[PDB]
CSV table of C-alpha atoms and ligand atoms in Angstrom, one decimal:
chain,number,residue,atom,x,y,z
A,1,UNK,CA,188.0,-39.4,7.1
A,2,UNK,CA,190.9,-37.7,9.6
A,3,UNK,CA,190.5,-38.5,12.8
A,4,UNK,CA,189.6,-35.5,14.7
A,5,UNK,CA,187.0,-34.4,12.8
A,6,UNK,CA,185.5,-37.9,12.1
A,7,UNK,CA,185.4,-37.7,16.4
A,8,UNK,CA,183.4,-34.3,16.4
A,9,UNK,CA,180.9,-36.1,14.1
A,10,UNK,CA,180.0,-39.2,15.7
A,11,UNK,CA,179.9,-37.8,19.4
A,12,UNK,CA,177.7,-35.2,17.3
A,13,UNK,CA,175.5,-37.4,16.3
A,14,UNK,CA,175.6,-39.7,19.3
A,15,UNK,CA,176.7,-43.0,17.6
A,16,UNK,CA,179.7,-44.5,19.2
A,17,UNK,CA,177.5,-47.6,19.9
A,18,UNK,CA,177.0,-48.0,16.4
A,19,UNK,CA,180.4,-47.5,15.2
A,20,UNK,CA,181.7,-49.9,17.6
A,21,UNK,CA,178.9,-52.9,16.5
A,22,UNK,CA,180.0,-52.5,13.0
A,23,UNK,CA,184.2,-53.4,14.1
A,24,UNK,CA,182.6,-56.4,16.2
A,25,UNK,CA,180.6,-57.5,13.3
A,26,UNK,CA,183.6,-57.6,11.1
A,27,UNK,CA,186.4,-58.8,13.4
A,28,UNK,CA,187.9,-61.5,12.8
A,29,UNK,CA,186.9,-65.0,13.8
A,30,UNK,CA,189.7,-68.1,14.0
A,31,UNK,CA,189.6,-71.4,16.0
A,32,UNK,CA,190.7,-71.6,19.5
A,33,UNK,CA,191.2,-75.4,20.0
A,34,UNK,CA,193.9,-75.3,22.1
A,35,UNK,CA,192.4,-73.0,24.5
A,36,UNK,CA,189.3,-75.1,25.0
A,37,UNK,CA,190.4,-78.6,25.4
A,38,UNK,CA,189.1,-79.7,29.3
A,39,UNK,CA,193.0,-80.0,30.4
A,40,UNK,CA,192.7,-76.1,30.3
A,41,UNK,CA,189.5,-74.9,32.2
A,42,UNK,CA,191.5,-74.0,35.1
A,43,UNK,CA,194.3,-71.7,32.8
A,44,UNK,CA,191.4,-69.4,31.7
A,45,UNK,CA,189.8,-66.9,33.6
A,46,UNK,CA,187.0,-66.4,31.5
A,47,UNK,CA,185.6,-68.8,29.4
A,48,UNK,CA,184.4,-66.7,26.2
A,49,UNK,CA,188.1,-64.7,26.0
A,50,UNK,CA,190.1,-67.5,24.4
A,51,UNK,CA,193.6,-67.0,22.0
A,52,UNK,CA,193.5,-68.0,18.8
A,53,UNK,CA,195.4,-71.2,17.5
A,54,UNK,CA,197.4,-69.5,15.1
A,55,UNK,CA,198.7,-66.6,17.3
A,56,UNK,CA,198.5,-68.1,21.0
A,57,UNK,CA,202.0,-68.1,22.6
A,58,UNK,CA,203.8,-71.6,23.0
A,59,UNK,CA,205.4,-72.7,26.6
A,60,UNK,CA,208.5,-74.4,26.1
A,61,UNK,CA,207.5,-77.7,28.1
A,62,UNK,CA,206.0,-81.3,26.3
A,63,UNK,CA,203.7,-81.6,29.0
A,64,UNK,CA,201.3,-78.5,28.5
A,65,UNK,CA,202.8,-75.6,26.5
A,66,UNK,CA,199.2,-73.7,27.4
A,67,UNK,CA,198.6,-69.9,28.3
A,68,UNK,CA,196.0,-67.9,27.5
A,69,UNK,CA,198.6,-65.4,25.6
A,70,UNK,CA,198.5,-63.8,22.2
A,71,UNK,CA,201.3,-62.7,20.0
A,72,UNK,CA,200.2,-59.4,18.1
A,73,UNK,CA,202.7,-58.4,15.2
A,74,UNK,CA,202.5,-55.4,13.3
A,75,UNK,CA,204.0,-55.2,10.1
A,76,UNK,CA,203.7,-51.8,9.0
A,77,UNK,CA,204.6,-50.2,12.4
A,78,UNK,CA,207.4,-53.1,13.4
A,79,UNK,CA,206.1,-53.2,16.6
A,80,UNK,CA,205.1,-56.6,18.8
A,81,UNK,CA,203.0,-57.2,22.1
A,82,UNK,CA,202.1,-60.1,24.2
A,83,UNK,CA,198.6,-59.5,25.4
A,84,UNK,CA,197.5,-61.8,28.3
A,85,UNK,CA,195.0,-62.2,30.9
A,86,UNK,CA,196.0,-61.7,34.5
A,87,UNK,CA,198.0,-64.5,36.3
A,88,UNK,CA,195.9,-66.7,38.2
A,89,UNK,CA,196.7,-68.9,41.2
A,90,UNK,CA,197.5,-72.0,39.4
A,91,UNK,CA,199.5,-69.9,36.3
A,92,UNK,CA,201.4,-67.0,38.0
A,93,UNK,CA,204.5,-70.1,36.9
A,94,UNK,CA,203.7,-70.3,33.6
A,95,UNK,CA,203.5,-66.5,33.0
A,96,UNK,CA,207.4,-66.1,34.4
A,97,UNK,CA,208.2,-68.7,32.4
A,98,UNK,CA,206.4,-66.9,29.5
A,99,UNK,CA,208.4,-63.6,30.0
A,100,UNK,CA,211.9,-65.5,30.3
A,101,UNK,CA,211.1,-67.6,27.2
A,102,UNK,CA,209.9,-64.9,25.2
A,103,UNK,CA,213.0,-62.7,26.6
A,104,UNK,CA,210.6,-59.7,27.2
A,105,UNK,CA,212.2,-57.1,28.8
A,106,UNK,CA,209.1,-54.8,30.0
A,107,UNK,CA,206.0,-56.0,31.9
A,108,UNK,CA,202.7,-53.8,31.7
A,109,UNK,CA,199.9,-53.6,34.2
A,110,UNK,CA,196.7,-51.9,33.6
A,111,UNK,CA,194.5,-53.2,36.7
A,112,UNK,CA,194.5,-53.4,40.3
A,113,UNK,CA,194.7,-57.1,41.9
A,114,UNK,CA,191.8,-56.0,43.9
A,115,UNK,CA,188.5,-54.5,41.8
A,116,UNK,CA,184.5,-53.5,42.5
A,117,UNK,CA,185.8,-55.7,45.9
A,118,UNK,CA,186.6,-58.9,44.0
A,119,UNK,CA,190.0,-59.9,42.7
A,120,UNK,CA,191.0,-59.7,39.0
A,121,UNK,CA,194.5,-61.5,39.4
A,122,UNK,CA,197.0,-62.9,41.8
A,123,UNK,CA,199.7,-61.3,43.7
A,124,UNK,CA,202.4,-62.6,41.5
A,125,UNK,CA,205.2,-60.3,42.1
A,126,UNK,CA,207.0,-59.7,45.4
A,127,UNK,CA,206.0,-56.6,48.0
A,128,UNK,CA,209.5,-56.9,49.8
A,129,UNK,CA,213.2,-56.6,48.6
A,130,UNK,CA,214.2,-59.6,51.9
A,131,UNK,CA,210.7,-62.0,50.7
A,132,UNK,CA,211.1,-63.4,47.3
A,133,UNK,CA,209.2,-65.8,45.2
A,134,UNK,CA,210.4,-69.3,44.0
A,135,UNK,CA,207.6,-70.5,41.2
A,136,UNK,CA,208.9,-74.4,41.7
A,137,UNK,CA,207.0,-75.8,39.0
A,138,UNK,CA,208.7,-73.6,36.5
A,139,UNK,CA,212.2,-73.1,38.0
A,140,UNK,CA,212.1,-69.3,38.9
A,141,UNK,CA,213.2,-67.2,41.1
A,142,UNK,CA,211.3,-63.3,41.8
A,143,UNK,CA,212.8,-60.6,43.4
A,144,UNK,CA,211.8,-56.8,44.1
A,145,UNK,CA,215.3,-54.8,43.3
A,146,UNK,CA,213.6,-51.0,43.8
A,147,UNK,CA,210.2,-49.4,43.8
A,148,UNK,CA,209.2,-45.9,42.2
A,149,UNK,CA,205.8,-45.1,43.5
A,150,UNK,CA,204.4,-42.0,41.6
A,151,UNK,CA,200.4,-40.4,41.5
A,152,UNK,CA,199.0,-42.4,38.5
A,153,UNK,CA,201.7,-45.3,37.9
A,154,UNK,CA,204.6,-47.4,39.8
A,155,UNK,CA,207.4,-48.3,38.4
A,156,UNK,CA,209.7,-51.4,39.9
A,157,UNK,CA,212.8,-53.2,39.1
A,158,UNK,CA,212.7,-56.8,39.1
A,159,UNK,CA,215.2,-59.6,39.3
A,160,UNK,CA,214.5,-63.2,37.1
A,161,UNK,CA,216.3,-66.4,37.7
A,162,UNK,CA,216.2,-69.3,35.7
A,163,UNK,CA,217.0,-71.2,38.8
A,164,UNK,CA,218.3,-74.4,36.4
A,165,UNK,CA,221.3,-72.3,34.3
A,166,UNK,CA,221.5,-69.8,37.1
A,167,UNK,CA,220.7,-67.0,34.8
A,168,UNK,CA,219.8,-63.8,35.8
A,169,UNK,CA,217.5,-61.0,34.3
A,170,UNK,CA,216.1,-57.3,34.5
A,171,UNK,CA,212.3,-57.0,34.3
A,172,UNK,CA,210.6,-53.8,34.4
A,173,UNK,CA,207.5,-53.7,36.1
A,174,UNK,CA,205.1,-50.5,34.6
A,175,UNK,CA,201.9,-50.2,37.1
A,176,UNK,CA,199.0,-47.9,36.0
A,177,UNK,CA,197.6,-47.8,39.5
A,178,UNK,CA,194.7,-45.3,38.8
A,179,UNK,CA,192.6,-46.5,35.8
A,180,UNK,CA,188.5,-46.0,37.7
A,181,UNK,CA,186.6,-49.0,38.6
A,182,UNK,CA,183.6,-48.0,36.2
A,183,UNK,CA,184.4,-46.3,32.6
A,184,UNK,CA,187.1,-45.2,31.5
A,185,UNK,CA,189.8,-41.8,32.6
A,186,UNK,CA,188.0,-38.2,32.2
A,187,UNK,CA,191.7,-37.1,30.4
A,188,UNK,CA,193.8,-39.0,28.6
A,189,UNK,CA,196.8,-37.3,29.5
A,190,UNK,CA,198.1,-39.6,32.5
A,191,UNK,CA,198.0,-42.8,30.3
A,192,UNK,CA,200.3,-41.3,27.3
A,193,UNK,CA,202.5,-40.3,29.8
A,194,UNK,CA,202.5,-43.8,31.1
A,195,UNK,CA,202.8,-45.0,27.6
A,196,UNK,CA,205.7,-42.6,26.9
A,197,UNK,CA,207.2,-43.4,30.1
A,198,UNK,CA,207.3,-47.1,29.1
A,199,UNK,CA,208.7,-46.5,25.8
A,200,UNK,CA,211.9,-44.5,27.0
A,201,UNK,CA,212.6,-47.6,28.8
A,202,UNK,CA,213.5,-49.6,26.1
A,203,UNK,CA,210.8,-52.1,27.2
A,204,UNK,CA,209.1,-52.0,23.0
A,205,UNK,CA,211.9,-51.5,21.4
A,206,UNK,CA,213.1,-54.7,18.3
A,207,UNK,CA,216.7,-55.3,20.5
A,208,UNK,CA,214.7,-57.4,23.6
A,209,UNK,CA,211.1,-59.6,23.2
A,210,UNK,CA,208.1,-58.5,23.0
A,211,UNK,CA,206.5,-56.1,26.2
A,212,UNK,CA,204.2,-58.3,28.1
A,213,UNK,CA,200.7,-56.6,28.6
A,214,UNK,CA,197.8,-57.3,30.6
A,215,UNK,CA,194.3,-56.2,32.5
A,216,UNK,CA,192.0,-58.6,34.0
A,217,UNK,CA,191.1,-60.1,30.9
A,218,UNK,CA,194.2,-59.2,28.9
A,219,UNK,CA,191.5,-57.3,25.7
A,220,UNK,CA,190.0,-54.5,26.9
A,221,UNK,CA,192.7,-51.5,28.8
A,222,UNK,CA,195.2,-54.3,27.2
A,223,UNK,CA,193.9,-53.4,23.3
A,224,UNK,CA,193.3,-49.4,24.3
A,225,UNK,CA,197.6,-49.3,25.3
A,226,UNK,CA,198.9,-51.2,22.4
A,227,UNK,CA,196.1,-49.0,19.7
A,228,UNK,CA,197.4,-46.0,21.0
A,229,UNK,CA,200.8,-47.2,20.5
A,230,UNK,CA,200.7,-48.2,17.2
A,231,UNK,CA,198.4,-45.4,15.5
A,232,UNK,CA,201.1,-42.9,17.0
A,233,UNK,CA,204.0,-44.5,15.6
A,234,UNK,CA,202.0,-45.1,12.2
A,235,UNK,CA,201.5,-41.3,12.4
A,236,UNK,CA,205.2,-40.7,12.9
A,237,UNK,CA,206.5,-43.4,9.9
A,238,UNK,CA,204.2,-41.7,7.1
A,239,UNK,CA,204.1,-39.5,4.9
A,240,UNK,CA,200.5,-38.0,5.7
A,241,UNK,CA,199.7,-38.9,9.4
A,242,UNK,CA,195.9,-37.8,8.7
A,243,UNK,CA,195.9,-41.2,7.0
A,244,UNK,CA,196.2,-43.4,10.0
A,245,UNK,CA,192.5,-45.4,10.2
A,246,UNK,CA,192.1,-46.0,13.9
A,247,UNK,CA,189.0,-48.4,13.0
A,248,UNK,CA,191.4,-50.0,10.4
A,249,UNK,CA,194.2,-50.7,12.7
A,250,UNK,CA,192.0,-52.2,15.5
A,251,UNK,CA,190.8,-54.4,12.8
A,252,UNK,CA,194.3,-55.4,11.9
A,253,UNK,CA,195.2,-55.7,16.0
A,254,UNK,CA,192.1,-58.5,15.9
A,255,UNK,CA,193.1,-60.4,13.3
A,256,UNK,CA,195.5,-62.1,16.5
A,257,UNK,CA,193.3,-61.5,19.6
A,258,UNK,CA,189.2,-61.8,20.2
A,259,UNK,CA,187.7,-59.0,21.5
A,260,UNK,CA,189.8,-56.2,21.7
A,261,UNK,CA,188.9,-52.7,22.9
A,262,UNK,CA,185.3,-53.9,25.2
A,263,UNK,CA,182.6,-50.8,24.9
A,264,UNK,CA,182.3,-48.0,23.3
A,265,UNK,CA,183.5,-45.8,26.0
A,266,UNK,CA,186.6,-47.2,25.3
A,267,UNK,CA,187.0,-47.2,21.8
A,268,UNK,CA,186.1,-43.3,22.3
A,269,UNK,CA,188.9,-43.2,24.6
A,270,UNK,CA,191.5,-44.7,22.2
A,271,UNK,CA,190.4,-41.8,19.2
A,272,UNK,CA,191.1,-39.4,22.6
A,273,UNK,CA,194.1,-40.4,23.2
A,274,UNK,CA,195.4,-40.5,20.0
A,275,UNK,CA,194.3,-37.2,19.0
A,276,UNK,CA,196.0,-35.8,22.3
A,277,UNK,CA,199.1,-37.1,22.0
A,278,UNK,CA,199.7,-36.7,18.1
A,279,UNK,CA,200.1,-33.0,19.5
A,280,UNK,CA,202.5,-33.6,21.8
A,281,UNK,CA,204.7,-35.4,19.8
A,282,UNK,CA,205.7,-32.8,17.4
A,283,UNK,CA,203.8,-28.9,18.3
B,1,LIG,O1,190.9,-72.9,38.9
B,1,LIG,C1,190.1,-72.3,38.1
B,1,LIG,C2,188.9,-72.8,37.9
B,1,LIG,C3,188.1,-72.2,37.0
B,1,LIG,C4,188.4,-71.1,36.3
B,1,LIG,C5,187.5,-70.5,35.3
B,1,LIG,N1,187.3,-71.3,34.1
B,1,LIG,C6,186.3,-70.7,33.1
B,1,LIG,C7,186.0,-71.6,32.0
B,1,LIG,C8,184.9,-72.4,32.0
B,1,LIG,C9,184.8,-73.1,30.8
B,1,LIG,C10,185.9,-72.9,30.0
B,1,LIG,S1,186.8,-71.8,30.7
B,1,LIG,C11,189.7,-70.7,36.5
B,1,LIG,C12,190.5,-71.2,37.3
């Protein structure tokens, strides 16, 4: 069926639970070895959102090359993401190390550090141009360059050092600040102009790495940005956008990442913003 009328129908008939039990029966299911050997408990935030072993990204060290960190690559759209969980107090190292290895130009934020009063992921970029950050285990060097503080997002300039070449970097820092603590946004129409806000920085475009983007757990507001993203550009690349299967391409997104999109209320809110914004694109 198209999309907006296939919407009408099911919150007709009330059965967006339903809908979404069916893509979690059918997901895909691969091991995640790596992710669960006892070496790792303390790189893991959550012990039943693991990466697969096929698709997890690699660190470049002999020691432990482990993060909790996914490589999605879709074909048809030629788009990639890195989705990952939130830096934690022993990983905030490896996840700069990540971005400078992976030579991703665009970071992606999607949570506040502090949540429902608890904290869903460390401070691991720098709140003051004079205080920087040196991650010693990794070799790497975080500054604050500028900060662009607007009603639903923030946007800041960051500098990398690979403190061992003495190699520098740009790193764009995208902040949705204003994502509610319970559900999901009434509107969709301050997170596609987040999302089209990242994209005119260059940040998922083929000539830099793949844009780094996380939440708490890195598979729930993580899956709903990268969706939207893709069914978009899909709609844009064919011939007859109506045939874009938003079901089908989350399906497709899971094949390299457990779990993605986490209630109904969200998948509901990825058809919204989809239908929303294939408007504005053209007329
Ligand atoms: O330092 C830390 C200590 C524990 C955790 C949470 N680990 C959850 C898991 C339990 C079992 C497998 S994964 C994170 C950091």
């Amino acid at each position: 069926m198209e999309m907006e009328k296939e919407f009408e129908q099911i919150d007709k008939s009330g059965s967006w639970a339903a809908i979404y039990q069916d893509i979690r029966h059918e997901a895909s299911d691969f091991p995640s070895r790596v992710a669960k050997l006892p070496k790792n408990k303390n790189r893991n935030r959550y012990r039943d959102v693991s990466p697969f072993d096929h698709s997890r990204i690699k660190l470049h060290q002999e020691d432990n090359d482990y993060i909790n960190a996914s490589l999605i690559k879709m074909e048809e759209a030629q788009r990639s993401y890195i989705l990952t969980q939130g830096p934690l107090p022993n990983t905030v190292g490896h996840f700069w190390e990540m971005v400078w290895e992976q030579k991703s130009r665009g970071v992606v934020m999607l949570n506040r550090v502090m949540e429902k009063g608890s904290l869903k992921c460390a401070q691991y970029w720098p709140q003051k141009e004079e205080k920087e950050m040196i991650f010693e285990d990794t070799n790497l060097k975080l500054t604050l360059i500028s900060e662009d503080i607007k009603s639903y997002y923030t946007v800041r300039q960051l500098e990398l050092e690979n403190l061992t070449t003495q190699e520098t970097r740009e790193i764009l820092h995208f902040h949705y600040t204003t994502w509610p603590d319970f559900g999901v946004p009434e509107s969709p129409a301050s997170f596609l102009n987040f999302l089209f806000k990242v994209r005119e920085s260059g940040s998922l475009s083929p000539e830099h790495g793949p844009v780094v983007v996380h939440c708490s757990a890195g598979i729930g507001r993580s899956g709903t940005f990268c969706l939207a993203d893709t069914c978009l550009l899909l709609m844009d690349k064919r011939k007859d956008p109506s045939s874009v299967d938003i079901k089908k391409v989350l399906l497709e997104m899971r094949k390299f990442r457990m779990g993605l999109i986490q209630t109904a209320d969200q998948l509901r809110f990825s058809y919204l913003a989809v239908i929303e914004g294939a408007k504005f694109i053209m007329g």
